[PDB]
Amino acid sequence: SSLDNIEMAYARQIYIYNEKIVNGHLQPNLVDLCASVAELDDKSISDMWTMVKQMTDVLLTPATDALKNRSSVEVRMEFVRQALAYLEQSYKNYTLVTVFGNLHQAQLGGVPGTYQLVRSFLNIKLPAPLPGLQDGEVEGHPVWALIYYCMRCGDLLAASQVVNRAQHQLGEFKTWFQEYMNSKDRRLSPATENKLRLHYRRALRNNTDPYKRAVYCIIGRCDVTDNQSEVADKTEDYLWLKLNQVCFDPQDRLTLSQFQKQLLEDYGESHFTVNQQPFLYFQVLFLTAQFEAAVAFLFRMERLRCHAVHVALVLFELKLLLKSSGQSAQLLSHEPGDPPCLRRLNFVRLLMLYTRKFESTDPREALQYFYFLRDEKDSQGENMFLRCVSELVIESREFDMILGKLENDGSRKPGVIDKFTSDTKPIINKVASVAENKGLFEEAAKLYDLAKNADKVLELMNKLLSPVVPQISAPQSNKERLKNMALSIAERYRAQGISANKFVDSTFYLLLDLITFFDEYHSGHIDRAFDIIERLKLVPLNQESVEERVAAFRNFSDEIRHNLSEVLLATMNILFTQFKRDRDSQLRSQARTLITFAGMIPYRTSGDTNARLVQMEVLMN
Template sequence: MNADKGAGIKSLGIHDSLSKDSAKVFSNLIETAKSLPTTSSELGAIQLSVNEIKKRAHELRAKTKPKNDHTRAHYLLAGSGLAIQDVESSLKALKSRQLMEQNVINRAVEDDLDTYLKTKKDENILSSIEQSLASAAKDFDNFINQNFNLDWEQRKIEVRENFGILTKKRRSNKHSVEVQSSMLPPKWGGSGRSILDGDSRLNVNENFATRAKFEKYAKTINSFNNARQGGYDFSLSHEVLQCFTDPTDANNRQLPEAWKILDHAHKVKDVVSSSKSFLEKQFLDYVGLLYTKVAGEGLPTNVNKVKAFIDHKLKNVNNTWKYGNLTIVNGVPIWAFIFYLLRAGLVQDALEVAVANKLSFKKVEQSFLTFFKAYVNSKDRKLPNEFISRLHTEYNQHIKNALDGDPFRLAVYKIIGRCDLTRKNISSITLSIEDWIWIHLMLIKQDVSKEDPVYEKYELTDFQTIISSHGASMFNGSYLNALMLSGMYELAIEHAMTINEIDAVHLAIGLACYEKLNISSSKDGNNNELVSCQDGEMKLNMTKLLGNYTKSFKFSDPRIAVEYLVLINLGATPEGPEVCHEVLRELVLETKEFTILLGKVNRDGTRIPGVIEERQSLISLTDEQAFLHKITEQAARRADEDGRVLDSLLLYQLADEYDIVIGIVNKLLSDLLSNTDISQPLLNLDDNSETNPVLIARKLINVYVNNLEIAQKIHAKRKETCILLLKMVDIRKAFYLHNWSLTLEKLEGIDMIPFADELSSRKRAQEFSNLSSDIKKNIPNLLIIAMTCVSKIVGELNSSEYQSPAKAQQVEALKRLAKNCMIYAGMIQYSMPRETYSILINIEVAL
């Protein structure tokens, strides 16, 4: 009893131990199974059927079948006090229990078999879908590789084509154009980048104020181009100044003044003389305005205006003079009076004041009148050479270092004698920026010679260096005007760009108009900067400036973009016209606004020019027809390549490539006929002549055939193909209206389907390969239409209440026609869609 109990306990212990071991084994199996290949792995899936699994499991059991030999176990268990019989009985009990569990498992497997099969079916479906997607992706990749070849040599050719540097070679049998590169880089380019894709962040449509300014300028530029083209006078500076309507705008206050400087400068080519006279006039205008405000004494003469200015400028609030060493004569500081008369450009008035007050001059100043008269009476406002050394001596000995000297006396001596050029500033007098610039301009000597001593040399370039070295910080919001007055127009544009880009662009246009700018040459190398130093002087990249500006509105306002881009040729370098042509070509290809830019063709075939052609006289075209043909044809090829068929049709017409036009129309019409179900109409009520191939073809054939000049440019075969396709359209219309007899009559009229006999069927089959692709692809539909019409007519005749020999003969004739069609179809069946022959057979069987 105890032994049995002990054996039972030990048996249970063995079973528990086995269960734990089994659980561990199964855990290991599960973990190992995770590393098996899955459907997503590169090794593929392991797919075994249920029978295969059962077969392999049976083979494994056969190899590892246990034997009832427990001899070795006897030794193992000898010292444990456990009888081998007990162990064997325990194993039998365990086997019985395992068998029961296996039966339960088998039943569960049988119950789950349906679920397994269903799951397997779902997996197969998903696998098929996955394979279809993979196949589609592979097909798409192949399509991309075939249609978008990334061969770099080919890409270089395409890039060159974009920039119009290709030579063309037409092929008569296709409407496409083969091109070969001239292997020359764009002459205008430095970076190879599109001119119209610059780095400007300007957006003229950003807000109402910016858009309003843009439109004002655009109207002015349009009027300017009209005047240039018409050959009549137009004051660009005057018109632009009208655009500055807000005088309180501090940021833009410099721009109107810059235009005033430009307006004055274009009348005088010499920068120094122009700037001096501008500053003098500006000062006199200010003095006059001040005179009206302070109500000065006496008549409003220039002398009295300057006198009133001195009272206002040099007196303190308590009516005392700001400077203690002023020479006062009759209540007027005489030297300050002479200085400001000179500042206002009133040289003769200054001499008269000096003569009238000569008694007030000190002994050391007695020779001043002699010097001053010689200065005023000289043509170029220069002191004659015989007086220069005497004045310099007097200045150095008595004026320069006089402790109680009048500061304005020093200024007057320095100006008329160009004294002490090592110290050009007059620190003892408070000067405005304009005064400071004016004094420097007065000290400049423009005809410096090698014989002149170094201390006598002060040229415009020296003054420009001083201004540029000081930079914008010194001039307190007047740096743009300082650059303009010193003749540094290129740097002025660069600085104006930091104030307002729109204003800066138009200031550059004005400077180019008045021939004040140095325009950079595209031959100067990699010049991507707006302003650069070339050949020792500053130059402006006008192409970059205008290209950047038009970037923000080339799509919204292409017509206005042309108005600006033609200005590239304004005062440009010798290759300016060529650059202008390249940029206009870019505009056409990028915007695709072909009707606006290149023109359109009326219903009667007449051509209406686009804006580029309207401005052809402004872009220096030596052969405008060649240029327009080239740019139009290039745009047509691009449109054709992009699949924009209607655009390419328009452009090829504009390029006078009428044969190509008919070729494209034939393809459109053929595709429409072959791809539209024969039970559907080819024309809908909402179709229009601009988009429907049928209407397009009818219009063009009518225009081209009636125009002898155009007709001569079209190949006879293409014209015949188009006419034949239009006849097929009429056949389709009769078929859609169920007019079976008329349909057959029209089919017989085009002579494309064998109506006569078996011999004609064979002959048509032999000629099939020689047909154009546009006709060939429509033969299957014509056969189906013919057989359908025969079937319908035969059916009507057979169902007729009254039968006659004539009707019987007609049925026989129709059946012979059907037989001829089937012979023909049988001979060309492998050149037709697979389903076409089946449809024809079904129709024939039903006859």
């Protein structure tokens, strides 16, 4: 097996999600089905899916195009809020593990109020007082530190409580903050927003209290260039600092498009992967709505291929992933007729790479991933899922497992693909078609016979029999192994009343009779073998039938005319033997008949055959 522990667990989860859609059940939450395995690994992966769920848990317009949802200002706004809610809660967990040694340890004693937690967080991260703080303290801590880390944790209420106990010190900041907490989308009114920004810009552009600076332009979304590096030293603190500063419809203003493009264009992977920590960059792209970038990026880490494919599937089963129309493009690209700030993922290629790894010895699991390509076609029109099953069968040669083995008793035990579509007639011909083009007739027959395509089964069975008609049928020979399959196809084609056009069909049952004629001839059962050839009315034995038999030879399958030489000789040698054992006249007359027939028929080795036939007739007299 080519699948690692983690990859295998995901496969099982994707089998469920397929079993549900294959039986018409409720469309379960894919993101939940993937996070179910994440908990079996380190929390590096669990915290990823947590971000994936929260970033995709946005009210969408079902049955709407992918590009439309992702271009709409409506959806683009909720992404920023879902991310900020993740950066705030994520930071809140950092503040817990900073005070208590373990999340469990914090829980048993009880998570304290965000206010008392933050206070018990300031104790550690600033033990001694910084001399540059302003506006005094509140219950033993600087008022601005409390406000910042409370807003950072996302509890505006806890921050407003701090403000209520410092009404005299904070001046007019109270009426401004109380408006920020009330107004939605973390934005103030243009009039009041103007009043505070100008005040900050007036004489507080450079204040000795960094926490004061941070809060002001987090509330006013100002000084976008100043990264407030004094307080936002971590990467998440930067993302959170900026997403609280982005704006929507000219100076000192930043928008999501600029920010998202500004980040990866100027500070690409190189900047965010110098510490050899891959998820750091992924979180930067995913929490900025650049899902295709983050997916391709994370898909290149050979250790995190599994995770990047699935986060692509989630975005794909939620009409959020922007697929690349052309299949000839690179993995990541920007369509020419699209804005430059969005990118597109060649989803078809993405799955095709992941599959090649475990498609060789783990076919069942491969199909589960090929199903997501059911909705796509190629330039030639083939259904992508169907084509992927053809290529996977041509390579793996797993016919019984994937296509269903058709035993020699008339049964068709369904295969693994039967689960996904009930119309399995084309691919069985596709797989049968190539194997036919590769001279693998004995297989192409079994495959065509699996799809009950007798036109092709009998055609190929005619080719495999004609060479072996006069041969000696011996144990385990190529004659027995082909005759016995032909008879197993004769019964199942009569018991089920199946037949190809009379040309193909007539020749097929005719060869089977001839194969019996030589099997009796090679055994010495002369009398019995003579009777068979007489029924077939293939070789004339009375002079009257020569005219009609000669005309019939003209339109009989060349697979029959080929073996005419051996038939005449065996029949002659049959009469020849019976002569040495009135009757003499009758054999003599029949001997003549064979000669005149052979004389009027142009066929294989007519030279040596016509001569031998005449000699055997002379010895009779």
